[PDB]
Amino acid sequence: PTSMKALDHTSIASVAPLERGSVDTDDRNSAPRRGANFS
Amino acid sequence: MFNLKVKDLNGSARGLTQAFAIGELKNQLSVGALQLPLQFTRTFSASMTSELLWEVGKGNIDPVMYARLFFQYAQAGGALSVDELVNQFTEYHQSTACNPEIWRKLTAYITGSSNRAIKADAVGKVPPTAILEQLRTLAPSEHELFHHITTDFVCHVLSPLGFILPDAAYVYRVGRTATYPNFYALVDCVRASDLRRMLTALSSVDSKMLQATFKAKGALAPALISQHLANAATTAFERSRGNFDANAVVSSVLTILGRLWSPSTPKELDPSARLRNTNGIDQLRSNLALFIAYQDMVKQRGRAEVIFSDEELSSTIIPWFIEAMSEVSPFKLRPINETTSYIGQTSAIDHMGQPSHVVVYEDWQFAKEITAFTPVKLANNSNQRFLDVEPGISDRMSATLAPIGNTFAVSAFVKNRTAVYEAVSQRGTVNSNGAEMTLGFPSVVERDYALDRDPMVAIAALRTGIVDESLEARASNDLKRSMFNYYAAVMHYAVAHNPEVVVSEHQGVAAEQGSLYLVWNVRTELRIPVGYNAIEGGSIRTPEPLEAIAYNKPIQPSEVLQAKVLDLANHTTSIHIWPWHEASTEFAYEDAYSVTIRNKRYTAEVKEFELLGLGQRRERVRILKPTVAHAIIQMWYSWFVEDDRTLAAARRTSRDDAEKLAIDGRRMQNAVTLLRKIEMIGTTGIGASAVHLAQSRIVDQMAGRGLIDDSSDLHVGINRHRIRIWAGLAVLQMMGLLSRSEAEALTKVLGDSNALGMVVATTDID
Amino acid sequence: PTVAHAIIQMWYSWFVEDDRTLAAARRTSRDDAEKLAIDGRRMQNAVTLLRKIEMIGTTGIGASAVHLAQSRIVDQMAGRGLIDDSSDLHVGINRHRIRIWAGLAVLQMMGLLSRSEAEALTKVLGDSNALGMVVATTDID
Amino acid sequence: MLLPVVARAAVPAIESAIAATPGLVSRIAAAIGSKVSPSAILAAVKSNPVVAGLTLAQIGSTGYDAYQQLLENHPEVAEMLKDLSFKADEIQPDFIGNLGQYREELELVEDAARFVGGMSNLIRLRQALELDIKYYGLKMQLNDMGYR
Amino acid sequence: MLLPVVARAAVPAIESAIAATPGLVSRIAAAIGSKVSPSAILAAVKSNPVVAGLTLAQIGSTGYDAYQQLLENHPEVAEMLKDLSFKADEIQPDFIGNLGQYREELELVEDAARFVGGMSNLIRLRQALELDIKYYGLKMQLNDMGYR
Amino acid sequence: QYREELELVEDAARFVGGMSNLIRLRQALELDIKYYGLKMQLNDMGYR
Amino acid sequence: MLLPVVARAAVPAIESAIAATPGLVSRIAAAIGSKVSPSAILAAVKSNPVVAGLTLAQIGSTGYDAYQQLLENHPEVAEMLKDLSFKADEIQPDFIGNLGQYREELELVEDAARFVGGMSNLIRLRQALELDIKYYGLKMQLNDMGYR
Amino acid sequence: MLLPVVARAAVPAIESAIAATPGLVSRIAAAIGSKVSPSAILAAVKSNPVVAGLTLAQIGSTGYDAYQQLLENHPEVAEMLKDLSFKADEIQPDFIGNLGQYREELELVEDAARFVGGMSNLIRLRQALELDIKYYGLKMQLNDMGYR
């Protein structure tokens, strides 16, 4: 099997956002919002 | 929707009152006591634009916009001011340019060759983000936004030679601009004149010569590059050096205006006969946007001082101050009539003349486009993530939303309102109070959704005038900056339609040495005052910009205000670094259409992914918020329930036969126009596919029990008119446009008026 | 096609012989102005390399390895019950990773190189970090 | 400095607390970091609002009134006041694990919530069912009389 | 019915618990609502998986093993079974108010979190600072030797 | 004697942000560990 | 939810440790921050995998087996769990300076390494020389017979 | 990190052996260079596979199957472990030493042979390192005089 290991450990060029925020939102699932009753 | 009692302005809305702007928290504000005549013929309005995504990585430098990035990074970023920023930029620029090594070391890296010439063929390629990585170590800074500006500088001189990879890309969002200058927005835009003269020197370096000597000779040492950069970067360092403090350019030149407006200026300090005659003061004398800026100035500093030489020096300041602003900037001078064009007014008149209610509203062009992106991480625990626009989800909604657009235009809301106050009002005068003034500002509520803030603190900011501290500074900085726009946007309006204005000087409580407030001359031709003033002479002189509105006749907005959507589609590859989770709404929905057929209950559930044509439920995708669309609908909801409330409030106490029948004449006529509108939404692409499915979950649920079929002569129609209505909410519910609570009350209103009962009554013949 | 295996065997010999000397020539210098000439040379190769391999990947033999590499993972994944792939396998890294591995396969599926030689040729792109600093792909259709 | 409106009411509140007991005078001198003399701190209060707040935190008995009114007088001191005055709330050893058991339970409510409507509705609906039966009879009867 | 793979382990597990003590036999007969005779419930277990689960909830000592294996081969019952078997977790009187005090505090963490990165990072960064000083020296020295 | 010291704070200040932030961040670290656990758990329940 | 495959092994493993000694029950209650009652923590383990891991760190004797199996079926917690459970390794006062002396030495090996090849080769080549002489004779003789 | 699959194979293997006899502490410290304590050597195993493979081969009663399991599960350690464990086979008086035992060794020579050159060259190179240090200095000095 070919080894892609070495190529796997890498870093990404870093950069800083102008306005910080939205950080912990990376992984979340909001479960759906219901509609109103009808009549 | 914001209601104020114009009689007591102080209590109801202190944000828009002038008494607050010049520093009177207490009730008292001077009457038309002392005065000087004046005419404001010009103003500084921001150009009409809203935020756009602009990408910083590529080799170009567009000086106007990098300047704009500083505004946002420093100001809205939470930092002190762009002034302190730019200063720390030129200490940074002095560090690299005036330093001989730092231009060698990174031309050793990009060219690869320390001690010897490089041929013409053997020219490698170094990606832009690379050289940035190292420049970080050489000339370190606490602001990454500096390293980007130097990085794509060297990229610009080296681009022709081809030492760098083009392919890499990167992106930020520039911010929104206040339409009218706050005091500091002057100070900023003066420093940003320096900065723009900085960058225009960096930007303009061609290095064509270095390109010619490379071709013919065939090779060149780093000694030619590393000088030719160092010559460029020190041409920019020239142009920075020796500019005046913005803080003391403006602080003075708003004072020496402030002394030639105010009538009461002590002769001990009088702007002299020369500077009064200076070229350009004439023009800046009659300019409004400065005035309301001046009022701010004294609100804060409390005072003023002229440091600059009162004569010889201060006559080279002005021509420098004019050239800063006058030059293309975010702020460009315009005739005063134009900048308020979109505001419009309408009023409900008694028999005599005077206002009962009077409405002020911002017209809008409803935004008919919407986009949906899926966020994609670069690597685990990396915030670089860049989104992919997905067409075919968006083509649905924008072809769904386009039908909604035509039918909600704002003018049709107030055209509806005044039709209410015609019917509800008695026959008799209104002496009891000043006419209440309701003002729709969809822009207010709009800014609350993109910033995610309780509508109650936004309104209550205008009412009491103080901003709640409980919120984090990122909001307050966009809240106050907002609350100042409306203040300004009011006075440009009042002044535009009452060209006669008169400048007094407030000194009752002696809060500040120098103060100013306008007083309008408006000729009312009315018997009794609204608000409170003596209404003497057949004209009333009112310090409050609001009152001076109330006496206007109806006005039709001549220019639609324009929202415009943020654009993801264009640059797909570039990695988004700005947080996009603020402007993103999660997209998921569930609902059940319940009907009762022959004494049982049949419920059809439905999911949003089915409505869109998607076969599977995909979690990731996030609708980019439809703010201005949610702004308008929010308005139209609150004015609907408000109307329908005020009628059923009168309908009880009417005590007349002729009039009572005119109320129920109104409600019914109202509610079935309500419904014919929602039924119109049901025929839309999402409306269609919601219906087709709902009937189909109901059918196969009845499979087990054989029961007789309908006439459908009108039954197909009666059933049809009902199922559409429920589509109408479902589409509104699933997009952000209507919250679930207000969707219920909106059913209840349509429910008891038995609107549906009356809708069918037109489809039968008897 | 031994004439072809001859050249590409040579190229891999010389190329590795470079980076052995530079990192050898760097640690000798013990002077800063030079070290950035070398550290600029290492990187400046490792992209020119990383582009050769990827440009190789675009070749039809190249492409057909790509398409098939993803396609089997997508369909392997859909059974596992989550489709988040489509977004993720096209990214800053994993579009390069699979791009390269298809570029080193085509060399190995031919005689042109030995699977141990490619394994080391990878390790050069590992340290030089040329990978992370590009973040941009070119498609030869 | 210090705005006068705050001063007419604020100055005597502190002075009263000082005259009540000396033991506080040493405390505030430590917290604010001011000269122990009662005349000194009173000179500091007038000078800075931030300082004025920390004093009113040290004495909450009589002082709570002015403190709130000071919030209105200066937005900035209160904003930078909330941070300077802070105490870590002692956490119970059992708490975080004790919360772990309600994971199963709260997810049950939110299933019931979404169905009904806002949480406010469900609290109502719960009462409607818990409500005595006669009432259902009562309401039926008013409808029998043609009232609704 | 019940899948054999489960049933193989399930049946003797229950039968063992029965043989251990009679007191359980009466309990399960009450919960499942089946004839008290040990032969009856054992006939019911085989018939329905839902029933099989409730039995294994009644006896957790020896039975927990099979239950999980039942849960594997039957994701279907998993939802239904979770509902039928439920107990309200007794809540402490102090709890909800006791939580009210941490409102101020958690909002402080999430200000620090967003800045650093994911919560995982901040937990790391906190340790890095708390970490002994010598280590900073150690790492500096390896860089002195030219290691990276 | 504090010349050496204050220049140290202002190096830490600029990094974090306004002085107000650093006073907060300092507390966040000094804060008890359990709280980090608490916040993690609310996120475990799906509360943001 | 904890996956059953793990939970099957996990639950009795913990329960066994509890039954072994009470002294651990108080410890885990402190670390996880859960109600001290053995029934409580056992309710928490089932609820969260992260919690399940910290428990198995507290007891390593019998518990190490399940922990690894937990780690397999949950690569997710692996990162988070590694952070929450950490102890600063006590460093020896002599160490960092003691390492400073080997700077001269290791640079000598890496000069020899590059020449030969990978470090693996040099370890071999070193043995080849250290090897007894007769072997060189042996190999020569097989070549004398024709063997290669 | 050490693969969890092989982890459950090695850890009971090395532990049972350590508790079986204390004498095995002589192996761990000799090659691996682990700390004197039985607890720390365990952490070394978990840390590195190479370290682990040298723990498995050294304790041979229960270990072989476990060692071969480690091999396949983490194949990079193959070349390393087989090499770092080598034991000289001394000498056979009889002519037919063969590949019976000496197989591994005569392989080893050839690698070393291949690298250096013709079989003679190595034996030469063997001696050059065996020569007294002085002879080097001699050759250098006779070079200094300008003789070569």
Residue numbers in the entry:
A (entry chain C): 293 to 331
B (entry chain B): 1 to 766
C (entry chain A): 626 to 766
D (entry chain E), E (entry chain L), G (entry chain M), H (entry chain K): 1 to 148
F (entry chain D): 101 to 148
Sentences from the study reporting this entry:
We use bacteriophage φ6, a member of the Cystoviridae family, as a model system to study the assembly of a complicated multi-shelled virus. The inner T=1 shell, composed of protein P1, forms a dodecahedral polymerase complex (PC) harbouring the three viral dsRNA segments (S, M, and L), the viral polymerase P2, the hexameric packaging protein P4, and the assembly cofactor P7. The expanded PC is covered by a layer of P8, forming the outer T=13 shell. Here we present the structure of φ6 NC to near-atomic resolution using electron cryomicroscopy and single particle analysis.
The overall resolution of the icosahedrally symmetric areas of the reconstruction was 4.0 Å, as determined by Fourier shell correlation (FSC, threshold=0.143). The NC structure revealed, consistent with our earlier observations, a total of 200 P8 trimers forming the outer protein shell, following T=13laevo quasi-symmetry. Each of the 60 asymmetric units of the shell thus consists of 10 P8 chains, as the P8T trimers contribute only one chain to each asymmetric unit. The structure is α-helical and can be divided into two domains that are connected by an elongated linker: an N-terminal peripheral domain (PD; residues 1–83) is followed by a 10-residue long elongated loop (residue 84–93) and a C-terminal core domain (CD; residues 94–149). Instead of interacting with the CD of the trimer they belong to, for the majority of the P8 molecules the PDs swap between the trimers, each PD interacting with the CDs and PDs of adjacent trimers via heterotypic interactions. The presence of P4 hexamers at the five-folds provides also a rationale for the observed closed conformation of certain peripentonal P8 proteins; if the type P8Q monomers were all in the open conformation, significant clashes would occur between P8Q and P4. At the vertex distal part of this density, densities consistent with the side-chains 324-ProArgArg-326 of the P4 C terminus were identified, allowing us to specifically assign this density to the C-terminal residues 292–332 of P4. The relative rigidity of the P1A–P1B dimer interface is now explained by our observation that the C-terminal part of P4 bridges the P1A and P1B monomers whilst still allowing interdimer angles to change.
